[PDB]
Structures are given as C-alpha cells and as structure tokens.
Amino acid sequence: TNIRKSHPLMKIINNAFIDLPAPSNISSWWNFGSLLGICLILQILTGLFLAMHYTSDTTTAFSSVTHICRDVNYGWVIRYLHANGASMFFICLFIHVGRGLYYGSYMFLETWNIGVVLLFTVMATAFMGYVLPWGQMSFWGATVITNLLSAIPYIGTDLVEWIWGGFSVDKATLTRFFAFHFILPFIITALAAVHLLFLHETGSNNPTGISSDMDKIPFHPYYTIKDILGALFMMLILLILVLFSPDLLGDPDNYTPANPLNTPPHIKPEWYFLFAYAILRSIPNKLGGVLALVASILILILMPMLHTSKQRSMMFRPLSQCLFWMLVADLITLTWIGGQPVEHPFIIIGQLASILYFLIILVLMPITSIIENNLLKW
Amino acid sequence: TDLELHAPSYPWSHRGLLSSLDHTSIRRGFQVYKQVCSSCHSMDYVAYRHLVGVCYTEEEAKALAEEVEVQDGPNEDGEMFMRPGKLSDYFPKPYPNPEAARAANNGALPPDLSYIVRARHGGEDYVFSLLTGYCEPPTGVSLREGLYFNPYFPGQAIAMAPPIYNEVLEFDDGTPATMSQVAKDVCTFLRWASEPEHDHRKRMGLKMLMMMGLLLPLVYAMKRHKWSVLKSRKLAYRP
Amino acid sequence: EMFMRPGKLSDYFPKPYPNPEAARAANNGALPPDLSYIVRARHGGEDYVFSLLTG
Amino acid sequence: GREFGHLTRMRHVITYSLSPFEQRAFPHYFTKGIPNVLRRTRACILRVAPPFVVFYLVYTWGTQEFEKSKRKNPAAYEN
Amino acid sequence: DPLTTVREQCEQIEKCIKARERLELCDQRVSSRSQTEEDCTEELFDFLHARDHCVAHKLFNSLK
Numbered sequence A: 001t002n003i004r005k006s007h008p009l010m011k012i013i014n015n016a017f018i019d020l021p022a023p024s025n026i027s028s029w030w031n032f033g034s035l036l037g038i039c040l041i042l043q044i045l046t047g048l049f050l051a052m053h054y055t056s057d058t059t060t061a062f063s064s065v066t067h068i069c070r071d072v073n074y075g076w077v078i079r080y081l082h083a084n085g086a087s088m089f090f091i092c093l094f095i096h097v098g099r100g101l102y103y104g105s106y107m108f109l110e111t112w113n114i115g116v117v118l119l120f121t122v123m124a125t126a127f128m129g130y131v132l133p134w135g136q137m138s139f140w141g142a143t144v145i146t147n148l149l150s151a152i153p154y155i156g157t158d159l160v161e162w163i164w165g166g167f168s169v170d171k172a173t174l175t176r177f178f179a180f181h182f183i184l185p186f187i188i189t190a191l192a193a194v195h196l197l198f199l200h201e202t203g204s205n206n207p208t209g210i211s212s213d214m215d216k217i218p219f220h221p222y223y224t225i226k227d228i229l230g231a232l233f234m235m236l237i238l239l240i241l242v243l244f245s246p247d248l249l250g251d252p253d254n255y256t257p258a259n260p261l262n263t264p265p266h267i268k269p270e271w272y273f274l275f276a277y278a279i280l281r282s283i284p285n286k287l288g289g290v291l292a293l294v295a296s297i298l299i300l301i302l303m304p305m306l307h308t309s310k311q312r313s314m315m316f317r318p319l320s321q322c323l324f325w326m327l328v329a330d331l332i333t334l335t336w337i338g339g340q341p342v343e344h345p346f347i348i349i350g351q352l353a354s355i356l357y358f359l360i361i362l363v364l365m366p367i368t369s370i371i372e373n374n375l376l377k378w
Numbered sequence B: 001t002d003l004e005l006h007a008p009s010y011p012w013s014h015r016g017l018l019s020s021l022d023h024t025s026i027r028r029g030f031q032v033y034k035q036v037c038s039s040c041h042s043m044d045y046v047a048y049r050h051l052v053g054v055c056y057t058e059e060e061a062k063a064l065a066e067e068v069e070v071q072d073g074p075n076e077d078g079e080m081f082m083r084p085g086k087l088s089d090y091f092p093k094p095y096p097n098p099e100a101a102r103a104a105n106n107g108a109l110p111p112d113l114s115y116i117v118r119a120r121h122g123g124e125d126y127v128f129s130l131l132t133g134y135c136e137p138p139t140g141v142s143l144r145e146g147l148y149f150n151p152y153f154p155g156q157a158i159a160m161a162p163p164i165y166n167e168v169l170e171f172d173d174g175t176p177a178t179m180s181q182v183a184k185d186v187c188t189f190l191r192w193a194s195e196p197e198h199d200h201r202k203r204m205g206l207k208m209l210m211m212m213g214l215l216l217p218l219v220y221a222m223k224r225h226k227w228s229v230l231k232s233r234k235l236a237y238r239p
Numbered sequence C: 001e002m003f004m005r006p007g008k009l010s011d012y013f014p015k016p017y018p019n020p021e022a023a024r025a026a027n028n029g030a031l032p033p034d035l036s037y038i039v040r041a042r043h044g045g046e047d048y049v050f051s052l053l054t055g
Numbered sequence D: 001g002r003e004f005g006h007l008t009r010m011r012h013v014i015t016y017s018l019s020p021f022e023q024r025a026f027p028h029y030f031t032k033g034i035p036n037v038l039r040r041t042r043a044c045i046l047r048v049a050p051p052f053v054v055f056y057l058v059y060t061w062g063t064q065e066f067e068k069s070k071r072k073n074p075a076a077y078e079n
Numbered sequence E: 001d002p003l004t005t006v007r008e009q010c011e012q013i014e015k016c017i018k019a020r021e022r023l024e025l026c027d028q029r030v031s032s033r034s035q036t037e038e039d040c041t042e043e044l045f046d047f048l049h050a051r052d053h054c055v056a057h058k059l060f061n062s063l064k
C-alpha cells in the first residue's frame, strides 16, 4: 500500500516536513531561520579540521595557525571560512529576533523561552574561543573580562583562579578554554532540536495576525523550493566577502605573537559585542556594572506579559510603528559609540542610549498601546 | 594627546579587483633585502623553497643559500659542526637572543618582518611612505642622541638610522637604481611575503561568478512554474 | 651561552653521551637499553633481572 | 492530530483555476513592477526614514567637533 | 632624482606656498623666545598634507 504512511521512519518525516498545513502569505522574513541551520552544519564541519592541527601549547599555539595558513593544501581557504562564517551566523540572529517583536511572535511562551537560553550559549562560545588564537587581543581581553567576575564580594577570589590554573594565562588555561569550545557546541544542537517540538501543535503564523485554518496549503512543493532558492543565494555573498576582501571584518592585531611585554593601545573586540560592552564601561561601580550587563538578555523574558493591545502585529497599528524604528537606531548609535576612545561627548551620548534602550520598552511601549486602544474602541 | 600623519594613497599596480602581481619587481626586491637590509629582522617563516615559483629558477635558487653557511645540529663525532646548507632551512637569523639585540640597538627590539605588513593600520602605502619622507627636525624640539627625526611615527622619532638612499646597491638587470624605484621594489616584495595567496585567489574568485551567474537564473524559472498554479484563481461567493 | 649552571630541584637525571649514537662507538656497536621501563618490558619481571646478575 | 481532514468549517464558497502548462509566466512584468513600488514606497518612506534621520546629525556633530579639538588644539593652547 | 624634481614642481601651488608662509611666520614667533609652548608640530603637518595630496597623483607616472 502507501509506504509513505506505514513505515516507522517515514511517518516522522512526512508529518514533519513534507505534509504539514502551512499558511499562504508568509513573508520572506519567515525565510531566515532555515539559513541559520545551514550555518550550524558548516561551523561544526569546518571547525574540526582546525582542532586536528592546533596545539594547546602556550608557547606553541600562535605558530600553529601561522603554519596552517601557509603549510597545507587549501588551509588558507578553510581558516577564513571559519573566521567569516560566524560574522554572519551573528547577522542572522538579529533579524530572526527583531521580527518576533513585529509579528507578535512571543505569545508562544514555550517557543520563546527555549530561545533566550540558546542566545546566551551561542554568544558565549565565540568569546570563549576567540581568545585561543593566542594573540595580544586574545590575552588582553581575557584578562579584562576575567577581572570583572572577580569583583563579587565573596564569590570573586576563588572562581577566578580555577579557570586560570594558577595566577595568569599559562599551559593550565589555554587547555581548558580549548576544553570549552568542543562541548558548548554539541550541547547547543540538542536545544535546537527541542525548539521545534513546541512548534508542531500550534502551526506557523502569518503577517496579518489572524488565525487562518481556512486556507492552509502544503509545505512540499512550495516551501521546499522557495527555501532552496534563497539558500543558494547566501553562498553568493558569503563567498564574495571571503574570496575578494577577507581582511575587511577583522583587526590587524592578532598577528604579533602573544607577549606580556607589550600591551595593545586601542583594545576593542569585534563589532558584534561592542553593544553589550558599551553599557558596561558606561557606568562606574564595578559590582553594579556587571549586573547591568546581564539585565539585557533577561530584559527579554519580561516582555510577553507587558503586552497591552487588543490586536496582533504592527501592520494595523500605525502609531506604534514609530517606536520600533527608534529602537534599532538606538542600537546603531550604541554600536558606533563603543569601538572608539573616550572623549567629551562620547560619555554623555552613549549614556542616553543606555537610559533609552530601557525607557522605550519598559515605560513607553506598554503606555502608548492604550492611547490607540481608546481610538478603535478595542 | 598629539596628531598623526595618515599616509596618502597611490595607484598601486596590484590595487584592482581583477589585477595581478608584477613578477619582476619581487625578484629585484630580494637582492635589495639581502644585501642592504637583511640583518635586523628574522624572516623566519620564509624558507628557501618559497621563491622558486615566484622569483628564481631552482638551479638558479640553490646557489643563493650556499653562500651563507650556518651551524648544524648535534650528532656523533662532530656535534654542532659547520655545513654548507640545504634548500629547506629557514632564513639565517642575524642575532643570538633578545638580550644581545637589546644591548646592541638601544634596548629596543627590532621587529621581525614576517607579519610587519598586515599588522599596520594602512599597509603597503604606509610602508612606502615611511621609507621616503624623512625630514630634519623642527625648531625648539628636543631629541635623543641616538634618535633621528621622522614625521611618520607615533612618537615622531625612531631609532632607524637611514638605511636607504641613492646607489647603495646595484641592480643586476640593467636598471638605473634610484631611491624611489628600489623602495617600490622592496614594498612589492614585502607584501607578497606577508600573503602569497593573492594570485591563486583572484582566479577562483573569477571562475565562481561566471558559473554561478548562469545556473542561478535557472532555479528562478523552475520556481515560477510551481507558484504559477496559485496566482490564477477567482473566488466567488453564493449564499 | 653554553656556560654551566649549578643545578636545582627541577633538573633531570643527566644523560651520559652527547647523542645515543656515541654508544655504538665505544660499546662495540651495542646500544645500552634504557632503564625506565626495563622492568615491565620483559617476561619475568623483577625476578628476571636478579637471576641475570648472579648467573 | 491536526492534519488536512479536521479544521475550520466553511460553506457556500467556490474557486476556479487553470494549469501551468496552458499559461505564460510573465504577464507584463516590466509594465506592472514599477507602479507598485511607486505607490508603496511613498507610504513607508516616511515611516522608516525620520527615526533614522536623527543619527546623521549627532554623528556628524560629534565627529567634526572632536576633529576640531584634536587637529586644532594649538588654537586654544595659548602662549 | 625624479622625485626631487616633482616635489619642486608640486611646491609651487597655492596650498604649499600659503603653508610655507604660515610655517616661517610661526618659526619667526618661536625663534624670539625659549620657554614658549610652540614647536612646528602643527603647521608642518599642514605643509606635508598639502604637498602629498598633489604629489601622490603624478609621481608613479614619471617612472620608466
């Protein structure tokens, strides 16, 4: 009879990809999340051909990458795909997140909360293993981040030395940071396998905000092809960036081999943290400052129950659409501030962004959603 | 709390997207490095095998390494003995160790020029400027006895006793050796040493566009077919 | 460099020759076995060596 | 347990459709692409720009002022 | 030798001459005293920028 519906393995994939009711208006924006999956398989795969060669020797580490990006076949390609294919996995995140604050996508409490955890794990693996190319930026950011968690009144003294294996970076540290990279990765994949289990049993959304069980089309021939087409469009831009102008997104200060004898003049991390580092140094009081740094990834779980409108999505809410575009411009000025020395207006101005990322979505957005409820009589 | 002098730009012969490397400038820059300047840095990562595909022919290349003889390793009945030299070995170091280097040249280490180009805000252009525009010191400024005035430095002065000027060398190819030309050949050599994958990169970066740029316009058409079932329906209501 | 140091707690058991290849020169082309694992690398054990000596 | 048999209930409606092989897939693409963008960009050019417009001003103000007090300090470094 | 000639030719423009008058006026100021804060740290940079902007264009052409 029909083999597609009686075999124990193919029931699972027919019910999951080939034959699930799907809406029909979905914006391309429903596109990006799959792209992330493509990135996930490529960061893992390309990243094992480096731990094959690399050597966790504190006075052997830096020359290791230097011989791989010279010595072996095609290694110059793979090094750069690994360094650039996560400048874009971090591109994907800010779009897949910001959309869910447009099309009312948090009312999925279960889906939404197994999210933020993944945000935290992915954001920490990259720092935890950008300090083991073993260069001055790598050591001198490690020292600075390390000295903050040590300002806990009774916590700090003891925890700090357990990760060093001593007093300062030696053979006892590079080894256990290289311990870290291997395992955060595998664990993360299992949290992504559970994000979707929730997704079955509520079905997807649609960019109007009205349940449409009336007209659901399949997810074979349509979503399968749209997806393949856009995916083979991510491999144009990725490869053009890497094989035309690789050196564009980096810094020329992981080339002098690590020394305690020098100290970099204008230390600053890559672009995609300078946002959760501009709050930090914006304020005095080190113990407090660490707390305001994590107020942010936990600002988010606090925003399903501040909703105060009667409708879903901003499509039919033309007055709230103003406040959503002063959020992203805030996050752009706040990234222009950070990677730059301290001068007269930088302190005064970066301050406003810190005050406002909070006044927009803490006071304003729940109090400006009633002024318009009062206008359509709900 | 001071100023700095950002280097200008030049129409470099390799500056384009689809350009190449002049493979006669690097050959002539190698002799300049060796005779003139090859004392103060290491050049460790560059062996003697890396110039045969770039600058010299193999039977023309082996005779360069022979002239500089170096100590060899321990063995039985004559450990640490002298030996002519082989192709593989790395460029012979000038100095024993950090302390002698500090002592001989005012306690300041000379950087080893293997990543000296990539690790400078700027690049080949800044390198070309720093080796031309020297000037006498202004009025009313104090300076160290061993220090010489240079306007391209963050400290505005560096221990570099001018090593490059007219007719310090002789170009065997039959070239009137002017300071500008020798500096240019040196810079073209140095960047290539800092990143040799330039020439093998811009060719796959070209056989990627032509092939892709015609397959991708296909997928679109198969798409349209499928989605063209659903954009042609009329939807009337009759209670 | 190549000068002599009195020695401290860290330093290893000083090795006799410049290289092991000197051993065949003086010892008839018979390289002496190392004595770190000679116990475990033999059938017998710590009673093969003893019975070798008085034999 | 929410497949294509059991969902919402609807009644008295009708829809029509052709095949793909009896039609062409480019009905005046050139002469209908432009007017749609013309009519829609106007509506939301006003809803994405003005929030973003007040960052150019502050960025240029700060940049030029800092450039002054870095390249022209010897103006107020009075002798 | 070509570079000295082209530097001479590129000195005669308005930028370089108005920079040199400023530089020598500042040196006239400074030479009269000894404790003054002024070196040639600033106007000399103006002179170098004014030269190099124009020098950087036609220099590479004059090669063999």
Ligand code: HEC
Binding pocket: B033, B036, B037, B038, B040, B105, B108, B109, B110, B111, B130, B158, B159, B160, B161, B163, B164, B186
């Ligand atoms: C007179 C011996 C000598 C000669 C010849 C010489 N160098 Fe140097 N160079 C030094 C010393 C010593 C330093 C370190 C200066 C310091 O740090 O105080 C140095 C530093 C440099 C620097 C500065 C690097 C930086 O970080 O600013 C550059 C550039 C340089 N050398 C290039 C060259 C090149 C290229 C040549 C060959 C054309 C050359 N020099 C020939 C001795 C020399």
Ligand code: HEM
Binding pocket: A043, A044, A047, A048, A050, A051, A054, A065, A079, A082, A083, A086, A122, A125, A126, A129, A130, A132, A133, A181, A182, A185, A186
């Ligand atoms: C979410 C997944 C991952 C992310 C985001 C990530 C991120 C990074 C980044 C940014 C670097 C810096 C490399 C450089 O700057 O040159 C790096 C290096 C490295 N990673 Fe990963 N990584 C991931 C997964 C892995 C995995 C799964 C492994 C091994 C199983 C791994 C092993 C390594 C090694 C050995 C290096 C050092 C090699 C080198 O620097 O060339 N990584 N990682």
Ligand code: HEM
Binding pocket: A029, A030, A031, A032, A033, A034, A036, A037, A096, A097, A100, A105, A106, A108, A111, A112, A115, A116, A118, A119, A122, A192, A195, A199, A204, A205
């Ligand atoms: C490795 C990290 C992540 C991966 C691989 C991932 C992947 C996905 C996928 C495949 C979907 C369904 C497909 C789609 O909707 O287009 C999805 C949906 C969703 N994700 Fe994630 N995501 C990640 C991180 C996050 C984060 C950080 C959040 C933050 C809240 C989040 C919240 C959501 C929400 C709300 C949806 C619902 C989409 C809808 O409206 O239907 N996810 N995600």
